[PDB]
Amino acid sequence: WEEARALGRAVRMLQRLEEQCVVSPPSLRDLLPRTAQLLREVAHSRRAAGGGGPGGPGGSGDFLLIYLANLEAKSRQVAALLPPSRLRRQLAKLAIIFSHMHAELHALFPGGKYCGHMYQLTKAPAHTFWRESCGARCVLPWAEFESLLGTCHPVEPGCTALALRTTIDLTCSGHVSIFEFDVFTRLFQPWPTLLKNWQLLAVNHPGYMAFLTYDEVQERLQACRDKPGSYIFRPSCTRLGQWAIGYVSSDGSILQTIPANKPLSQVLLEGQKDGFYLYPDGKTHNPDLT
Ligand SMILES: [Ca+2]
């Protein structure tokens, strides 16, 4: 069967990369063997008589077809860069993407065993939307997903929709999994104003940084070290669905805040009032979040 062969090809490509990579999270040296070990687990479980969950479009089989083709494409990108500033950045972005691919596979096939049909989103309104719109499916192509989301939260076609796609699609696969929609709706809660929240915080906010690691943001914030109240906020790529707010304190040290149940807009507005989050990316413009 073709899925078994494809799983073997993927495990081999991850081993080649792992050997070609011979530090701080996300690290390809860590992620490559971890993802391979998970795929070996998936292969074993797919031998079982049941365990595939509801079939058809967007089920476990479809998820793996799309996931392993994308994992191949990203692995080719890494191989083409590795030695046998630009390079550091390209390998950082790809490490973030691998951290995303690992987290998604772990969320949906923990221990190798599919749970995409049972998976539950963090935010209840978003969970209901997914199960009502998408049913038992764990993954959709972007164009279908943009249509379904639009029954509730329509986005303007063109550059805005494409920006939304770039934000939601953590694995850069062109498909949205239930795990990606969980992360997105957690980050940009609350549900009733979901895309307004995303517009105000991730398209029109100079403090937002996507696809940057902890080390890259520290390097960025150090530049602001003489402007206390400077801050940037990014989605964590190691603790998916959480924000990490990096900020310059009064004394000039770089601290971190992690939001919990409060929407980001509330955290930033309260941190503005308290005088902590004042100059986004060190810029003078701080957007009004009411
Ligand atoms: Ca994706």
Swiss-Prot record:
Chain ranges of the Cbl-PTB domain: 1-290
One of the protein's GO biological processes: negative regulation of epidermal growth factor receptor signaling pathway
Region (EF-hand-like): 116-188
Entry EC no(s): 2.3.2.27
Phenotype upon changing R234A: Abolishes interaction with EGFR. Decreases interaction with SRC and abolishes SRC ubiquitination
Result of altering T238A: Abolishes interaction with EGFR. Decreases interaction with and ubiquitination of SRC
Tissue: Ubiquitous.
An MF annotation (GO) of this entry: phosphotyrosine residue binding
Keywords: Calcium, Metal-binding, Phosphoprotein, Repeat, SH3-binding, Transferase, Ubl conjugation, Ubl conjugation pathway, Zinc, Zinc-finger
Chain positions covered by the region annotation 4H: 1-115
Modification after translation: Phosphorylated on multiple tyrosine residues by SRC. Isoform 1, but not isoform 2, is phosphorylated on tyrosines by EGFR.
UniProt binding sites for 4-O-phospho-L-tyrosine: R234
Effect of Y214F: No effect on interaction with EGFR and SRC as well as on SRC ubiquitination
Assembly information from the UniProt record: Interacts with ubiquitin-conjugating enzyme E2 UBE2D2 and UBE2D3. Isoform 1 interacts with EGFR (tyrosine phosphorylated). Interacts with the SH3 domain proteins LYN and CRK. Interacts (via RING-type zinc finger) with TGFB1I1 (via LIM zinc-binding domain 2); the interaction is direct and enhances the E3 activity. Interacts directly with RET (inactive) and CD2AP; dissociates from RET upon RET activation by GDNF which also increases the interaction with CD2AP suggesting dissociation as CBLC:CD2AP complex. Interacts with SRC; the interaction is enhanced when SRC is phosphorylated at 'Tyr-419'.
Note: This protein has one functional calcium-binding site.
Domain description: EF-hand-like and Sh2-like domains are required for N-terminal inhibition of E3 activity. The N-terminus is composed of the phosphotyrosine binding (PTB) domain, a short linker region and the RING-type zinc finger. The PTB domain, which is also called TKB (tyrosine kinase binding) domain, is composed of three different subdomains: a four-helix bundle (4H), a calcium-binding EF hand and a divergent SH2 domain.
Protein's recorded name: E3 ubiquitin-protein ligase CBL-C
Species per Swiss-Prot/TrEMBL record: Homo sapiens
Gene: CBLC
Whole sequence portion shown: 12 to 320 of 474
